[PDB]
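User: what does the whole thing look like in 3D?
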Amino acid sequence: KLTRTRLDRLYGLPAADPNNGKEYYEIAGRFSLISLVPSNDDYQTPIA
Amino acid sequence: KLTRTRLDRLYGLPAADPNNGKEYYEIAGRFSLISLVPSNDDYQTPIA
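Assistant: Here's the predicted 3D structure for the full assembly of 96 residues, as structure tokens:
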């Protein structure tokens, strides 16, 4: 809501002060990565 | 009444002191206001 303004019941998080003073907005979850590096023909040699 | 004076029986509030240790002067009641107001338009709202 905007006070003393002909505007109310807006939807969507606005762009004035979204951080609420809270320091961070945490998101958790898994993360998969099947990346592939130029490993040599020698199986005993890991490229890291 | 006014004693020890030649101008006595003064009627009405003088200009000196209505405090007299009285907490306040309470006059309750009500208002009734019919006002022309532009800020209560719940109408011109965008979609979504």
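In plain terms: The two ends of chain A are 54 Å apart (CA to CA). The CA atoms of residues 2 and 8 of chain A lie 6 Å apart.
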